[PDB]
Write a protein that binds this ligand. Structure first.
Ligand code: BB2
Ligand code: NI
Length: 160
């Protein structure tokens, strides 16, 4: 288990470095991955990005049993597939006790590498696209409050 960094920590604000090709397939990467899934499962998350546990790497995990397959995504690139935007509720492990409505692209393509270095290339919609976009934002130092445009919908979970 690792400790989840909280909003205000400068490490959530950095642009993350790519996973080097040296680490693809490695034991060391695999152990980081196991540690991430163990952390995410312990606190109930649907996703987790490496910088949230203080590892400066373009690596994300996500999934849950709107079903999203368990997935480990390295070095990602996201491409919006059209202009359609949708609002949905988000919260974040790094921003405990809050929720906010955020407008994200409805449809994206995402690509990157799996942990063995095999390419990933998928086009998704709705909740799956929302999760990817949230997680990838961590890799460019963006948390969801910096994406809100309707502040009438941002507030404490226990109030909302
Ligand atoms: C959909 C927004 C992406 C959520 C990703 C976060 C996990 C996280 O810290 N990602 O880096 C999460 O699991 N958040 C949960 C969350 O936002 N949920 C619970 C299930 C769906 C959604 C509803 O707000 C919890 C912490 C409240
Ligand atoms: Ni988050």
């Amino acid at each position: 288990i690792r400790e989840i960094l909280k909003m205000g920590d400068e490490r959530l604000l950095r642009i993350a470095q790519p996973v080097p090709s040296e680490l693809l397939g490695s034991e060391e990467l695999q152990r980081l991955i196991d540690d991430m899934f163990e952390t995410m499962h312990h606190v109930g998350g649907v996703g987790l990005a490496a910088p949230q546990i203080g590892v400066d790497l373009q690596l994300v995990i996500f999934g849950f049993e709107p079903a999203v397959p368990p997935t480990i995504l390295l070095n990602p690139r996201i491409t919006p597939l059209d202009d359609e935007m949708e609002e949905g509720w988000e919260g974040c492990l790094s921003v405990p006790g809050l929720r906010g409505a955020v407008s994200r692209h409805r449809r994206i393509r995402y690509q990157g590498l799996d942990p063995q270095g095999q390419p990933i290339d998928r086009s998704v919609e709705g909740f799956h696209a929302r999760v990817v976009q949230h997680e990838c934002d961590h890799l460019i130092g963006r948390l969801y409050p910096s994406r809100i445009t309707d502040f009438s919908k941002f507030g404490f979970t226990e109030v909302l």
